[PDB]
Structure 1
Amino acid sequence: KRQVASGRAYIHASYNNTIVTITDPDGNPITWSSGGVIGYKGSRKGTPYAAQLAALDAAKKAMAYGMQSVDVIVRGTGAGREQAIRALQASGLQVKSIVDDTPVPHNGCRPKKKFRKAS
C-alpha cells in the first residue's frame, strides 16, 4: 500500500535461475521473485518458462502497489533473460526503457576454474 506507479525492474539472469526484483525510483525493492519462488526446484529455475512466470509473478505482486511504469535493467548473461523481458512487457506494466547493465571487471579477480579454461 505504498503507492509508487513509477518503478524499476532488475532482471538478474543466470544459467541457473532468474530473479526479478521490483523497486521504487530510488532503487529500494517493492517486491521480488525468481524461479524458486514459483515452486520450481533444480534445473528448471533457469528454464525461460520459469523466467516468464518469475517476471509475471513479480509484476502482479507490484501491480498491487499501483505500479504502471517500469524502467527495465537486464543484468545477466543467461537463458530466460529476454523471456523475462517478454513477460514484463506483456503484463500491461508500461516498460519505459530497457538497459543492459551486466557488470564486467576491467580484468580484475581471478575467476573460478570452471569459468576460464584458457584464462
Structure 2
Amino acid sequence: TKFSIYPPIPGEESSLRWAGKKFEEIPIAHIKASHNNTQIQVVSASNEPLAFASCGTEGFRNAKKGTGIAAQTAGIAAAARAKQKGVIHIRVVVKGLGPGRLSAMHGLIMGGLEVISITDNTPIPHXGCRPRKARKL
C-alpha cells in the first residue's frame, strides 16, 4: 500500500503497528521550543510522565540555553531516561519556533528513540491577548 502522510484516525481499522502497538498507544514527546530555552517531556498515551529534560536542567545557563546544541543535549537526556522505562517509538509534538525546535528532535533520535510522526502545536490565537509592544532597535 502507498504511504500516507496523514495519521491513522482513531476508531478506524488501520494495519499500521509499531512493536504491536497502535498509533493511539505510542508515547508522546512534547517539545516546547521557546526563544531562550527548550523543554522536553516524554509521556505515555495515558498521560503518565516518563522523562523530562530541558537546557536548564542539563547545566546550560543564560544565552547558552537558547542554542541548538543545548536542545540536542536535552533531547539526549530525555531519551536516556525514557529508554530505561521501555520507550522505543514516540510521537513528537513540538510547539514554538525557538532555536531548539529541530535540534531537540535530533537528540531524541541520537538517544535511541524512533520518531513515527511529527505534530506542530504552536499556539496561534484566532484574534486572543494583545502581545507586548514592538522593540526600538
Asked if these proteins are the same fold (TM beyond 0.5), I'd say: yes
Number of residue equivalences: 112
Counterpart check, 1:58 vs 2:91: no
Counterpart check, 1:43 vs 2:63: yes
Q: Which residue of 2 aligns with 1:68?
A: 88
- Considering only CA atoms, is the larger Rg found in Structure 1 or Structure 2? 2
Task: Give the TM-score, by structure 2 length.
Answer: 0.75
Task: Give the CA deviation at 1:31.
Answer: 1.6
Question: Which structure has greater strand proportion?
Answer: 1
Q: Which runs of 5+ in 2 are unaligned?
A: 1-24
Q: Which runs of 5+ in 1 are unaligned?
A: none
Q: Distance in 1 between matches of 2:112 and 2:53?
A: 18
Contact 2:77 2:111 in 1 (8 A): no
Runs of 4+ with >6 A deviation: none
RMSD: 1.8
SS at 1:113 equivalent = coil
Higher relative contact order (CA 8 A, sep 6+): 1
Out of 11, 23, 27, the position equivalent to 2:31 is: 11
Task: Give the CA deviation at 1:114.
Answer: 4.4
